[PDB]
DNA sequence: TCAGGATGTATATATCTGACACGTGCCTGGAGACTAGGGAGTAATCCCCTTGGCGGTTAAAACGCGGGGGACAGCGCGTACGTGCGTTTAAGCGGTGCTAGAGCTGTCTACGACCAATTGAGCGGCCTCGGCACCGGGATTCTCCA
DNA sequence: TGGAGAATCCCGGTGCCGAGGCCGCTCAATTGGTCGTAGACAGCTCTAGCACCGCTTAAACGCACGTACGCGCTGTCCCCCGCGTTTTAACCGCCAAGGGGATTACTCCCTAGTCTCCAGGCACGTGTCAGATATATACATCCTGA
């Protein structure tokens, strides 16, 4: 019989793996293209240093990790294990972004 | 000693926007505190802006950029429009 | 020889000279521009007029002729941009906006 | 553009 | 048969899942991705707005890391390791 | 007799329409003196400072209760609990 | 010559006062354990504010805590208050 | 007479003269006291020493003799007072502390 | 052109603490940024303290009060002790 | 669903006061005018840091509908919170007395600013190796159908 | 409960490139003065914060009672866990352009500084009418009954 794990063990292993690792999780080039497209709406023909994009990616990843932590706390408080968009909305509202 | 405040100026602005509307002492103090806070914020923003550019003079552009950074959207646009009009009419006479 | 206020030159209400003195004595930089006090006075005057218009409208909506901190709080919180500007500011004698959750209502 | 406060 | 592959979807399901796993999330609903993309877009819009304003103030056309760091500090998100 | 809840909403409306202080002045002043005793002895307080402290405390408490009510409603309940306050403070970053 | 030591005035924040504050915030139903946690949070907040206020008082060589010190402490804590000066 | 650094006079590693110049040209006040740079340099050296010893302990606890940003994040987030001091600061390449909620653990 | 940094000072402090430990470049830049941030915070708080007291000179008392206000508890106590020792020994010499 | 009783809430009127609008002296802060120096604008130059196929991999980017545990709705319960009422407690006002300390004012001495001369410590450029990244291999440890 | 199977840690070998040390070369740190002034200190004034008492009365308190909502339990179901490999399916290394960020040199006119002079707002009285308070009354809404 095939040996396929119960749901949840792989999730915990992945959580441990990426909580022990400290490298970027977002593809560099798509994020750079998104940054350039967003900046195009402000000023045309703008140049970006590599270090600026790196700092942008670091800040975005840190903010996303914090937001997901708050969302997980809200989901646990809601007697659930699966995060929902309303959890993110509640976290942002309590923070003060909405 | 004498106390400095913006009470009469706020009163004149209120009369210009509403001739038949009064103002309370507590509301006057709140308005003065708000004006002082905005003044401090804009001055600090301009000072920091000049400092980052190795510049030792706050010009109209520093105040403009501070207004853009601090005031959100339409507030900043109307503020920069009014400031540009005021400085232009001042330097034209 | 006839003196004339700088505010009258720029048609402003807040005093250009006082703003210039505050900028000079605020320990911001070695020097300050000539048009910066005028620009700051214009911005402050616009903000004051904008907040006072809404405050007067709120006071008139409550059959009152003298603006009270409650009207100031209502005017600030009812304006989205002003609410963002003063999102970390609390006003004495202002109270809170009337807001009751839908789920709390009976049905 | 000017004097067009959304409010 | 193609308007199928796109750019704004570049923040893929694996990337958002990896970020959530790093954040401690164990199970993720399918609707999380769009909301996360919107929130990231808003955050990036604000930061880039401040950065471009600083760049325009400095008579420059190239956005440096200094501008991004200064914008983050102005937004209460001071970052270490870039100046 | 009114059904439970109607008086609750009535008081909610009444206090959301009013702006006066909701905390007794003398007990709050005594609490402030007790708290200040832990830092410096024989401290004197102005009336305006006490009023400002009370206003700030009331505003912060109202905001905290608003966040607690939002968290409680998120949990499909209508009764606030200390867990909701703890969650709100944790999300705020105070703990 | 009277050094009065005050204690147990944290109970001076009566349950009806907390209920009124919750009503102003929109709370409809209140558990019985809310009051103690609210009192604890309130005490922590005033401890944090008063520590800075007394520090400012000592710095200025004053024995009386003024409203300006409270406003400065609140602003330093990101809680700027309008209607008392500054 | 040979010149002696003010840092040597106070037995400090940080440069008293450099921080004094930074204070003078930082547009903070019209005048600067003599002992304020020394006191500030001492405080800065104490904070730096605290962070460096914590980072060294973190690196030694991972069989590493080289300080990396991961050790910085570990050291800062493991100290409650320092975490409170740097609760609004993000460290690049610092990572996240291993933290799995009890409810998420298998039961 | 010459660029200011705190590299040698931090390295010497670590050598005094950990004689056999090195630092990566990224962590070293993080150290420099942290030192600059603390410098800016203390200097700004001291300037605010001097402005509030209508003072035009930053002395040891203002910096000490800033340290007490910004550093929590034991950190503030130890920083005050170390700075007071340093200033006393400097005045003696 | 519709209707009456009881309740609170919105509305109109009087009068009555104290907080707001107004007027006034003056003095100190604002306005005029001249000077000098340095910081900002402008011009020219260097070169360092940002963008696309013959003569291209290969693994993310997204196909194939076979498929278990948590989200969700419903239901019963019993305790706990809301609501009302008599008592009692303490908050609030005002009145008096007094003093520690906030606030203002005059010296004048020590402390910092500023300039000139001097020099050594930190910064730019350039090796040089070893701690750390990668990998391969095996022992150890975690998970799962019995 | 226990080995099969897969994931992880450790042991050891090998190659790499970034930190540590070295060596100029400034220019900012140090020292020695001279000179202006900031507030330390002493003295005086006089304001309100403290302490206490007495009266009035509204709110906290304890208790009784009723009902409705959090919680535990049970049953249904769905979606995105999952591996199982296309039709045509993101990083490297390259080489190359060139433009703007950085640097250097002149120059000029804008503002700090100083002196003089004058009137605008700030403290201080002084009236007065808009909301506070009180009462009386009409209307909206909940509760209960049918």
Per the CB < 8 A criterion, the answer to whether A52 and E51 are in contact is yes
Listed by number, the residues of chain I in 23-52 with a beta carbon closer than 8 Å to a beta carbon of chain H are 23-24, 26-27, 30-31, 34-35, 37-39, 42-44, 46-47, 50-51
Residues of C in contact with D5 (CB under 8 A): 50
Long-range (24+ apart) CB contacts under 8 A made by B3-8 are B5/B32, B6/B31, B6/B32, B6/B35, B6/B36, B6/C14, B7/B32
Which approach determined this entry? cryo-EM
Distance from CA of G82 to the nearest CA of F (A): 9
Residue ranges covered by each domain of chain C: 5-90
- Alpha-carbon separation of residue G58 from F52, G29, I73 (angstroms): 19, 44, 17
SS3 E28: strand
Q: How far apart are CA B9 and CA A23, in angstroms?
A: 57
Q: How many CA atoms lie within 13 A of C35 on its CB side?
A: 16
CATH code of the domain in which B62 resides: 1.10.20.10
DSSP F73: H
Indicate contact of H with I: 3+ CB pairs under 8 A: yes
Distance from residue B22 (CA) to nucleotide J14 (C1'), in Å?
Answer: 24
Residue ranges covered by each domain of chain E: 1-83
Which residue(s) pair with F44 in the sheet?
G64
Query: Do the domain assignments include residue I64?
Result: yes
Listed by number, the residues of chain I in 47-76 with a beta carbon closer than 8 Å to a beta carbon of chain G are 49, 52-53, 61-62, 65, 68-69
Structure tokens at E21: 């796993």
Cα angle I3, I9, I15 (rounded to 5 degrees) comes to: 140
- For the four alpha carbons of F47, F49, F51 and F54, in that order, the dihedral sign comes to negative
Q: Number of B:D CB contacts under 8 A?
A: 7
Q: Is F13 in the C-facing interface, judged by CB distances under 8 Å?
A: yes
Q: Is A46 in the H-facing interface, judged by CB distances under 8 Å?
A: no
DSSP A56: H
Architecture per CATH, E1-83: Orthogonal Bundle (1.10)
SS3 F29: helix
The number of distinct structural domains making up chain I is 1
Give residue for tokens 């008579």.
Answer: E59
Q: How many CA atoms lie within 13 A of F62 on its CB side?
A: 26
Topology of the domain comprising H5-90: Histone, subunit A (1.10.20)
Q: How far apart are CA H25 and CA H36, in angstroms?
A: 15
Per the CB < 8 A criterion, the answer to whether F32 and G46 are in contact is yes
Q: How far apart are CA G81 and CA B33, in angstroms?
A: 9
Per the CB < 8 A criterion, the answer to whether G26 and C105 are in contact is no
Per the CB < 8 A criterion, the answer to whether I66 and G55 are in contact is no
Per the CB < 8 A criterion, the answer to whether C24 and C15 are in contact is no
Resolution in A: 3.2
Using alpha carbons, select from C39, G63, F2, F68 the residue that is nearest to residue B86: C39
Asked if the Cβ–Cβ distance from A73 to F90 is below 8 Å, we say yes
Residues of F in contact with A94 (CB under 8 A): 67, 70-71, 88, 91-92
Q: How far apart are CA H84 and CA G48, in angstroms?
A: 13
Distance of CA F25 to the CA centre of its chain: 14
Q: Which domain holds residue I70?
A: 7-92
Residue partners of G11: CB distance under 8 A and separation at least 6: none
Q: How many CA atoms lie within 13 A of A46 on its CB side?
A: 26
Per the CB < 8 A criterion, the answer to whether H88 and E76 are in contact is yes
Q: How far apart are CA A77 and CA G74, in angstroms?
A: 31
Topology of the domain comprising G3-86: Histone, subunit A (1.10.20)
The residue of E74, E81, E83 whose CB has the most chain I CBs within 10 angstroms, and thus the best one to mutate to test that interface, is E81
Question: Does the CB of H25 sit below 7 A from strand J?
Answer: no
Query: Do the domain assignments include residue B80?
Result: yes
For chain A, which domains are there? Answer: 3-98 (1.10.20.10)
- Chain J footprint bases within 7 A of protein beta carbons: 8-9, 19-21, 29-33, 39-41, 49-51, 60-62, 68-72, 80-84, 90-92, 100-105, 111-113, 118-124, 131-133, 143-146
Using alpha carbons, select from A75, C44, F14, I59 the residue that is nearest to residue B13: C44
Phi, psi angle pair for H101, to nearest 5°: -65, 150
Asked if the Cβ–Cβ distance from I10 to H39 is below 8 Å, we say no
Phi, psi angle pair for E14, to nearest 5°: -55, -40
Residue partners of G17: CB distance under 8 A and separation at least 6: F22, F23, F24
Per the CB < 8 A criterion, the answer to whether C23 and C32 are in contact is yes
Structure tokens at C55: 């405050």
């Amino acid at each position: 019989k095939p040996h396929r794990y119960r749901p949840g063990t792989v999730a915990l292993r992945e959580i441990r793996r990426y909580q022990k690792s400290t490298e970027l999780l977002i593809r560099k080039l798509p994020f750079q293209r998104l940054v350039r497209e967003i900046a195009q709406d402000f000023k045309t023909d703008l140049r970006f240093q590599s270090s600026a994009v790196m700092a942008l990616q670091e800040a975005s990843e840190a903010y996303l990790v914090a937001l997901f932590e708050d969302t997980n706390l809200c989901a646990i408080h809601a007697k659930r294990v699966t995060i929902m968009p309303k959890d993110i909305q509640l976290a942002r509202r309590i923070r003060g972004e909405r | 000693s004498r106390k400095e405040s913006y009470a009469i100026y706020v009163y004149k602005v209120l009369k210009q926007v509403h001739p038949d509307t009064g103002i309370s002492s507590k509301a006057m103090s709140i308005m003065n505190s708000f004006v002082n806070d905005v003044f401090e914020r804009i001055a600090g923003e301009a000072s920091r802006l000049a400092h980052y550019n190795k510049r030792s003079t706050i010009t109209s552009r520093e105040i403009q950029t501070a207004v853009r950074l601090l005031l959100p959207g339409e507030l900043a646009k109307h503020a920069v429009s009014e400031g540009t009009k005021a400085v232009t009419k001042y330097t034209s006479a | 020889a006839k003196a004339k206020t700088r505010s009258s030159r720029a048609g402003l209400q807040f005093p250009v000279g006082r703003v210039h003195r505050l900028l000079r004595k605020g320990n911001y930089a070695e020097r300050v521009g000539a048009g910066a006090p005028v620009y700051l006075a214009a911005v402050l005057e616009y903000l004051t007029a904008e907040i006072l218009e809404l405050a007067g409208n709120a006071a008139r909506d409550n059959k009152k002729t003298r603006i009270i901190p409650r009207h100031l709080q209502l005017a600030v919180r009812n304006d989205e941009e002003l609410n963002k500007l003063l999102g970390r500011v609390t006003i004495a004698q202002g109270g809170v906006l009337p807001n009751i959750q839908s789920v709390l209502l009976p049905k | 553009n000017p004097t067009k406060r959304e409010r | 048969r193609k308007v199928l592959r796109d750019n704004i979807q570049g923040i893929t399901k694996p990337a958002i899942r990896r970020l959530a796993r790093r954040g401690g999330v164990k199970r993720i609903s399918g609707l999380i991705y769009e909301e996360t993309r919107g929130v990231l877009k808003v955050f990036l819009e604000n930061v880039i707005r401040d950065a471009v304003t600083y760049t325009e103030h400095a008579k420059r056309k190239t956005v440096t890391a200094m501008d991004v760091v200064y914008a983050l500090k102005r937004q209460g998100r001071t970052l270490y390791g870039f100046g």
